[PDB]
Design a protein around this ligand. Structure first.
Ligand SMILES: Cc1cc2nc3c(=O)[nH]c(=O)nc-3n(C[C@H](O)[C@H](O)[C@H](O)CO)c2cc1C
Ligand SMILES: Cc1cc2nc3c(=O)[nH]c(=O)nc-3n(C[C@H](O)[C@H](O)[C@H](O)CO)c2cc1C
Length: 375
């Protein structure tokens, strides 16, 4: 009866989805300076988030053994897991211990693994719950899910991450406590959304429903496995302004794509194929730039900064739009159709991360750049 309030509440509910991982990733530079691992930490966090897909195996087993039980119990378990994990991370992130003879960060990595589990279960737990609503709220859900990534980047901007050795404006404790506040707000918004709602076969093997799952898997394998790995190697040779602009504008291109989808939405499979193609084009240009990390073409000229920022903006916006559109097309099916859309996203992301591990952590194909020097 009150559509704007429902839009706001579903937006906040969706915002509290992937905030912990998207905050850890942006905070990595402040933490790296103290931990004994060094700059090998982004390859540990990646493997942890890839292994976190065991939350699906637990959600499925609980949905099997308890067949007709309630549907809001996994949502609340995931929310409490996230809140308590972020509090414990804010409290005990700097404890090291000798494992295998080497000093290692056990508390940081264990809590990152728990948060990855919660965030991976959040998909197959939160997304199918929107079958109780008209399809115009999937777009608000995804807009909030994009704000989930946009807000920590602004927080790291205010903190002063990446200023080059200056001392930030506040330590990592304040950052993780702000993340805890975000997660509590999301839990309260979902509790209100529960008060707002009234008291209570041939498709899976079709070609039209496989053409959408393949698109979801491929676009998510690109956006969630490869770009987080080649980001710095692509953007760093062009300075500190290029890197900051690329990061912030790529993070802000998701909510704007979801707003544009709120405006007009595509519904033909061929249009989504074309959009995915023009996104893969830029996604491949970025990696072709990252392979030549020492000296890419057009370095030190104002053309390269623009040509490397616009690629990130275009890629992330196009893929977010295709995700929103394909998910809204599969909503006609039910909770079963929506459940299929989360599993595909997660399988694609897992395949992307597993495929990106060997070029990055085994053979070292990309070569880093020494600061204040032009090789
Ligand atoms: C290392 C890493 C792995 C991620 N994996 C996923 C993922 O599997 N699925 C997902 O929806 N988002 C994942 N994200 C976040 C994804 O970009 C997220 O949808 C947007 O950040 C906010 O929606 C990941 C983010 C990072 C930094
Ligand atoms: C795997 C890896 C990731 C890196 N990530 C960043 C980064 O995110 N931001 C950055 O400024 N430098 C990054 N660097 C470069 C790092 O800052 C560089 O080694 C030091 O500046 C050299 O003193 C990275 C280097 C490596 C090897």
């Amino acid at each position: 009866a009150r559509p704007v309030l429902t839009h706001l509440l579903v937006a906040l509910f969706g915002m509290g989805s992937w905030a912990a991982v998207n905050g850890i990733w942006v905070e990595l530079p402040v933490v790296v300076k103290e931990l004994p691992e060094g700059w090998s930490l982004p390859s540990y966090v990646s493997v942890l988030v890839a292994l976190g897909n065991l939350g699906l195996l637990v959600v499925t087993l609980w949905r099997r053994l308890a067949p007709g039980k309630d549907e809001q119990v996994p949502i609340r378990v995931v929310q409490v897991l996230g809140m308590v994990g972020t509090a414990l991370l804010a409290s005990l992130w700097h404890h090291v211990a000798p494992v295998a003879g080497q000093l290692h960060s056990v508390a940081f990595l264990a809590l990152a693994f728990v948060l990855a589990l919660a965030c991976c279960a959040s998909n197959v737990t939160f997304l199918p719950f929107l079958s109780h609503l008209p399809p115009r709220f999937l777009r608000s859900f995804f807009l909030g899910q994009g704000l989930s990534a946009l807000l920590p980047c602004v927080l790291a901007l205010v903190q002063g991450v990446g200023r080059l050795d200056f001392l930030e404006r506040f330590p990592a404790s304040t950052f993780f406590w702000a993340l805890t506040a975000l997660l509590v707000a999301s839990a309260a918004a979902f509790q209100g959304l529960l008060l707002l709602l009234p008291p209570p076969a041939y498709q899976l093997l079709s070609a039209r429903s496989a053409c959408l799952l393949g698109l979801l898997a491929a676009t998510n394998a690109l956006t969630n496995g490869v770009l987080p790995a080649v980001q710095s190697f692509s953007c760093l040779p062009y300075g500190r302004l290029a890197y900051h602009l690329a990061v912030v504008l790529g993070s802000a291109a998701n909510p704007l794509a979801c707003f544009l989808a709120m405006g007009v939405l595509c519904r033909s499979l061929a249009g989504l194929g074309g959009l995915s193609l023009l996104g893969v084009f830029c996604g491949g240009y970025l990696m072709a730039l990252a392979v030549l990390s020492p000296c890419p073409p057009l370095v030190g000229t104002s053309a390269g900064v623009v040509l490397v920022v616009l690629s990130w903006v275009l890629c992330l916006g196009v893929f977010s739009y295709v995700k929103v559109a394909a998910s809204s097309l599969l909503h006609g099916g039910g909770r079963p159709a929506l459940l299929a859309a989360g599993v595909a996203i997660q399988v694609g992301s897992l395949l992307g991360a597993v495929a990106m591990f060997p070029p990055t952590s085994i053979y070292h194909v990309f070569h880093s750049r020494k600061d204040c020097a032009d090789p």
